[PDB]
Design a protein around this nucleic acid. Sequence first.
DNA 1: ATCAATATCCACCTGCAGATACTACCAAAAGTGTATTTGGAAACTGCTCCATCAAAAGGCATGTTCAGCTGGAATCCAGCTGAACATGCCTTTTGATGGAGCAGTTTCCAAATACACTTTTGGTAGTATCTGCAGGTGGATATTGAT
DNA 2: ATCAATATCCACCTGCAGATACTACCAAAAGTGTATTTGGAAACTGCTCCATCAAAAGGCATGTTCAGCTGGATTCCAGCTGAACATGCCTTTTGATGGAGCAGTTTCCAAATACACTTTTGGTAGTATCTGCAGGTGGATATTGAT
Lengths: 99, 101, 79, 87, 109, 106, 103, 105
Amino acid sequence: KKRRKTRKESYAIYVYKVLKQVHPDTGISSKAMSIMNSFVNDVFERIAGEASRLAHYNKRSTITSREIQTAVRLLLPGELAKHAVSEGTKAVTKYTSAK
Amino acid sequence: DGKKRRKTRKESYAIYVYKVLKQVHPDTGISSKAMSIMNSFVNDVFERIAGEASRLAHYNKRSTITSREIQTAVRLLLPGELAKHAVSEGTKAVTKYTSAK
Amino acid sequence: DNIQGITKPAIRRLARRGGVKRISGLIYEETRGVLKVFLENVIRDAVTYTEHAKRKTVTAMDVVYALKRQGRTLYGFGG
Amino acid sequence: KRHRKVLRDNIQGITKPAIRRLARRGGVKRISGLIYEETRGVLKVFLENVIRDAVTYTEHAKRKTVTAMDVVYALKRQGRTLYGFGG
Amino acid sequence: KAKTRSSRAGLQFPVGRVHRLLRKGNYAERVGAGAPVYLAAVLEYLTAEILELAGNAARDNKKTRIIPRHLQLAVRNDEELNKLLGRVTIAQGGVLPNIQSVLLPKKTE
Amino acid sequence: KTRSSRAGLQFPVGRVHRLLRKGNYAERVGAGAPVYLAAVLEYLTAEILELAGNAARDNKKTRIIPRHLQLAVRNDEELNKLLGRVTIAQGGVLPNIQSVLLPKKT
Amino acid sequence: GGVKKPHRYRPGTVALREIRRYQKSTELLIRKLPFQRLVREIAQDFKTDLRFQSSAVMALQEASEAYLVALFEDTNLCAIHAKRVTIMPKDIQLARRIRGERA
Amino acid sequence: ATGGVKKPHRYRPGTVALREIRRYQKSTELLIRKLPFQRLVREIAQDFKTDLRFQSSAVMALQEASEAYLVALFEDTNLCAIHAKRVTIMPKDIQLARRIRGERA
DNA sequence: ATCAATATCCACCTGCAGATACTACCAAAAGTGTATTTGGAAACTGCTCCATCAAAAGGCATGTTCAGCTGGAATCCAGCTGAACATGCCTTTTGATGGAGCAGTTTCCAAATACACTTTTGGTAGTATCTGCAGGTGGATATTGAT
DNA sequence: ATCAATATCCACCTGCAGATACTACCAAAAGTGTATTTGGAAACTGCTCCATCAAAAGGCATGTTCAGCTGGATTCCAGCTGAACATGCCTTTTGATGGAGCAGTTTCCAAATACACTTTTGGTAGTATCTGCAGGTGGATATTGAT
Ligand SMILES: [Mn+2]
């Protein structure tokens, strides 16, 4: 049964987890979910690749968190960035404090 | 009196270009300005190719870029007749490499 | 009929979604003759991936990348 | 010994002829009256746009100057890759 | 295992998967352990941010389950997102109610 | 002996090789690829050079500059498409005027 | 011979009404076969006798149409810009040029 | 006797326009004036972020790239009046050109 | 067709910065040789899934008829947008000197790679009810378009 | 203002294409100390370049006047197009299999690759002579426009 078991690992579950922390009583069609996986996926590369670009310009090799900030700064439009730029500078200092 | 702290070597193809220039037009010159477009010609295209290739790897979960990917890369990127020639031109020198030593 | 097998009312149907009130007679061909380029260009890019992975079937992944690199990126098929 | 005087409303430092000139180069014969102003703002939007970027480069490299490369990085990344100035 | 890195940040986004995901594409040689979080966080929020306005779009047309149309309406009716996906098509999304000005009956008023 | 002459080229299969490892597009770099690459780049350079050359001549000049280059590039179908979102310093445009903009009937 | 004054929704109305009808609908607006016929007629010219995955053709029927749908909004504008309401194919041609299509 | 308008030589409205299109198309030098454009690159940065420096070069692109822009947008616009059946470019034309390009909404 | 009045071809020359042209050093890069280490051709076959056929139905299409009026086409007419004319200012040009703040050499450490061994859970693969909806039923009356 | 003639939009009705939640399951995705690897910031610190005033000067922007002609609103008007409305061909479908062929597998040598020598070279400084083209003056033919 482990034969055709080549996994198609997706964010879908994590997305439903999140689907609840603001709208805890909501359904979402598996086709409307298929979109949300194409979302974060898109958002992943976009930012990553930019932070990947942001290396060599500076003759860099280690992607530090910084170039992610910048990536997103460069990436995300107006007000909508501010929050994100914040949201992530948050969690970083939490895990700094954490184990 | 020169050489005052060794400046990180800025390296272009201004030679490789001009080499291949003289081949096309023996008496026909070239600005810095005129060249300094040409270097970006390379610059631009390389990365466009290395890029599209790198993409193909992870589309087939491959860890290496073969000259087969480059072809596909070129085959996708470079349009029309510009692709054909290139494809062959690529191979031509590839073959001169594969059948040496 | 293939390309002519694309219906004048279907042409109208899609146009209406764009908010087209009035459709001139010529449009019907032009629409087809603008839909063609789209496809040629799209599929060209698509199959080129097929022909790389060594496949006789145009996968879904074959397309996403076509439309992505085309610039007309699509959502909800990459699974 | 420094300078840095007040810096405001330079957009009109983009002057009718010079605007109008691009209108020639464009292959344009008869120019409306609202154009020149409308035009001045699009340039800003533009500028406005590319410079957020080229600075967010300078800004980032922990630089205090807008090196040629930045601007180009910022131009390409927007859709307008430019050959000539570097990289 | 004791507890998660994603919990050490309080999310629903796998700070684990990120750190490996950011290797497979070969985005660099070395990775600062700050980044895989910084990313997840942003991506997380972002995903939510839509879901919000999508879930907000649910009640309006008396339906409970989110369909693409609600995700499309979520996206396009916003400014800052419309732009972020000004070059993207959501499958089956359809188009926002928009009729041009001159088109209405009895000339143009 | 060098790998260029070895593949019969003018471009550096050495130097493009470096810029494939240091570049990071994958970990493992092929052996035909960097060749194929140099070759690839070399064709293009050449293609366009043999273009802005005649250009350079058209206006009776012998030192190819950007203008001729952008004349080459633009005046040609396949290249244009390769550089549809590209830009060329002191580019110049391709001389051209729309028709209804020309005067007739006295 | 007649009917004594019939109901005829004076022309243009059914159009505006269908706009109202079609704009809020999300499902595609071309028969799948003719499309899949055309999706297979052209594709051959790149590699011969192939197969199309279940989803693959539709991903196109999404995009293909999605492209067109918008491509029309743009056309209308031009027509409207020329103080018109009927989309003459000249509009399309103009609206192609601009995106970076015929230029 | 009193019949022959005036004497000074004047060219018809638009025949210098043609004369010029022909010209600023033939060549290539940047079309707004250096130092005036300059400040507009200085001042828009200083507004994003102060205590900053532009490389001798780096303003240049911002200019080169910036003309380019319009001249090419202008072309799109020139086309738009012609399409509306005209010889004159009124904002809308641009706004329309910006529109389709996908520049605004 | 000829006269007149500006802008321009067309070759002519200076003159200098912009290319191209040596030495000379010289640091990295490129190449040779083997050693290690491995990602992927190369056939074999499973099984989810892709290709027409089957077989009634009619939904969606086309060829159809009539007007309802929008494109384009002139007609005029107020006035903007171009050509020109007279000024002058601020752009442009060329060095000149502090002095920033960038770049490269030299150091030593926080953080990360590369192993190695056990731990948790996300995709897979079913069996079964769960469940909001996605398309008929009355019934109502606004949105349409005759009077 | 009158009110036939449709299309539309509300709760209320039920069945199935579709989401919800549990049990079984096992290679892999993930986390954890460890022992060792090096990027990268951090300071001294050369050296290049940009910010800056200088003064000359001069080309190019300003603004104003005067008209020639292109836009705008004018009514128009003939045939192009939506509507209806008749069929009726031609998608839709599900129903359920022939059968690829993509997926999956375990191999196994060519291919990649990291390690230590080796040898050229291409790039910068610096040094010093040529040489293409902008650019000014000047002498025939071009185009435009008032005749
Ligand atoms: Mn300011």
